[PDB]
Amino acid sequence: EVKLILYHWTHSFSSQKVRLVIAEKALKCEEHDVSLPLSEHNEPWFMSTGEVPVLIHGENIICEATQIIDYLEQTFLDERTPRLMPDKESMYYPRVQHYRELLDSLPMDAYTHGCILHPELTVDSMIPAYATTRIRSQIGNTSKLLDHDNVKYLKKILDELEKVLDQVETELQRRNEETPEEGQQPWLCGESFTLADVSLAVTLHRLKFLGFARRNWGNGKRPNLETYYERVLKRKTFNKVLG
Amino acid sequence: EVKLILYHWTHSFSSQKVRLVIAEKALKCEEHDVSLPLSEHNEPWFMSTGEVPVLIHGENIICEATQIIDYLEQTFLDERTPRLMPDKESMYYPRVQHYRELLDSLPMDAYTHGCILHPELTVDSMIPAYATTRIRSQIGNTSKLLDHDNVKYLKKILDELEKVLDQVETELQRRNEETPEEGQQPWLCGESFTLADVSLAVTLHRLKFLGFARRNWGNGKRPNLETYYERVLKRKTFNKVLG
């Protein structure tokens, strides 16, 4: 009876995760993309403010992406609805809860800023040369803070990204050992798809866009992570949201 | 071209101020009241959570009532649009800014809670006896924090309310002296209607509902404040929003 009403930016990292949770929970929702198509100068989304999506479910109006996702989990508990979180006392809950926080803490806003401002560190980046040169000209005429110390701050957080991926690479390795090679493979934290998988999937996809995917995984580096990303790419909910 | 889209609860104090700002700025907006009419037990709004309205203006999605109001002021600057804030260097800006904060700091949530839980301190309260007895029964079976120390905390903040109204009473007195008795009277902070007047108007109206209006003003107590409330009641924008 009640309608779900999401207001989001199509190319917003926080918003993307929310959409996927909806897709994973198989909920009918009236998504309202507010992002403008292209402007006079086709001002893309990778060029700061602090804007966040908002969900409206009847009397409840939830802002912030993490709050909306948690709301969805608690609100919709129909028997058909799939839960992206395990039981509080489940052996999986510590893992889902630990790795979900580990991935959400990554400063994606900073990674984006660095990708444009310093393409020297990127590999097969989907952000073009015109973007880099364009914003450098904007700087010359004049978020600067997210650049922070220039190339020195950027390399620092990119190495921290490797450390986080190292944890995830290890976790996936554990899954492959426990699971027989033939048979249904499990996700990051157990066989069922969880909120931790959502954060991981979206994070990896965004990294691919920034060109940091090649240097982190692939070519036999972090083989389990590479396999994971390929598996999640084929997933139907993933393809629908992140098409 | 772009549509304003407000999502609000009809009987939400924070939301009410936003609506009035829209009405004062004479902006066409698509207000979406999310409040449910009446439920099975007609659960009224004075019976906690922390929910806040959300504005959607094209790409911008602003939450929190104070942020939305500020956004409206900066966003819509058409020559026809009336500004509820003076120039930053205007003599009125310190006053509008001081008294706007003084009124927004009042814990209306607490005052509401006290009105129901302790009608002994109220006078001609619009909350009925069934409400008081109803929630006391709910307590017996079991925001408790906003009750805090029971009647001792409640009296404390009600006296602090008198102190704030004392400041406002003094400010209005100043206006009457400066203005000739015959001629257009000015509002709290100057002749033009400001955001300070919005906060003051809504605050007074809500107090009336809680029954704390009689003991604070009226019967010759705070005569300028009484006159103010009568004047703002007749105002068209006020009648439309707080009808």
Numbering used by the authors:
A (entry chain A), B (entry chain A): 23 to 69, 73 to 167, 194 to 294
Provide passages from the article that reported this PDB entry:
Charcot–Marie–Tooth disease (CMT) is the most common inherited peripheral polyneuropathy in humans, and its different subtypes are linked to mutations in dozens of different genes. Mutations in ganglioside‐induced differentiation‐associated protein 1 (GDAP1) cause two types of CMT, demyelinating CMT4A and axonal CMT2K. The GDAP1‐linked CMT genotypes are mainly missense point mutations. Structural analysis of GDAP1 indicates that CMT may arise from disruption of specific intra‐ and intermolecular interaction networks, leading to alterations in GDAP1 structure and stability, and, eventually, insufficient motor and sensory neuron function.
Using GDAP1 variant crystal structures, we identify a side‐chain interaction network between helices ⍺3, ⍺6, and ⍺7, which is affected by CMT mutations, as well as a hinge in the long helix ⍺6, which is linked to structural flexibility.
